[PDB]
């Protein structure tokens, strides 16, 4: 329910990936498909859990601060080159 934490999650996961990209002296996105980061450990990947791969809801900013308006738009989160649906981590955790 916190829209600030979602964008923070996107930012921090992206910079965690950027650390690995920098360590190989190249942060080109073509060189690092999501199979490099998110494939399980036994397959040779990093086994990273993912949550920055989701759409962040948006509503008009004029009335967002003064009322709770309906979600009218979606801003993309971390982009996956091509058609890939990396599972969310929250969907495997039951709500409180």
């Amino acid at each position: 329910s916190t829209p600030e934490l979602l964008d923070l999650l996107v930012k921090c996961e992206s910079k965690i990936q950027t650390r690995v990209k920098i360590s190989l002296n190249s942060k080109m996105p073509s060189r690092f498909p999501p199979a490099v980061f998110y494939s399980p450990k036994e397959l040779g990947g990093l086994g990273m859990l993912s949550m920055g791969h989701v759409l962040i809801p948006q509503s008009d900013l004029r009335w967002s601060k003064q009322t709770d308006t309906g979600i009218t738009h979606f801003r993309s989160g971390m982009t996956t080159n091509g058609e890939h649906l990396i599972p969310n981590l929250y969907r495997y955790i039951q709500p409180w």
């Binding site: 008009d60 009335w63 003064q66």
Partner: protein, 96 residues
Amino acid sequence: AIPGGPKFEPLYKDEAPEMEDWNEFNDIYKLIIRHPIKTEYRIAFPYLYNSRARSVALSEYHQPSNVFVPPEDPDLPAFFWDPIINPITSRQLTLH
């Protein structure tokens, strides 16, 4: 940003809540909602549809519409009544 045009940097980042107050001016309490104020209005009439209007630029309002259509086939004379033009019949008039 008009959805077909370029996107730049803000050029004015001073929008923090230093006043910490809503100024009871733009509140929903005393405003008639008829149609949303799109950004096309804020670009067409920059000095009316938005406050904080600094560094904006004004554009030519209108130009006389051009009514020249190039000839399809040279065999026709240059001066010729184009059928697209409506005929001049205005027997709806009360003259002297």
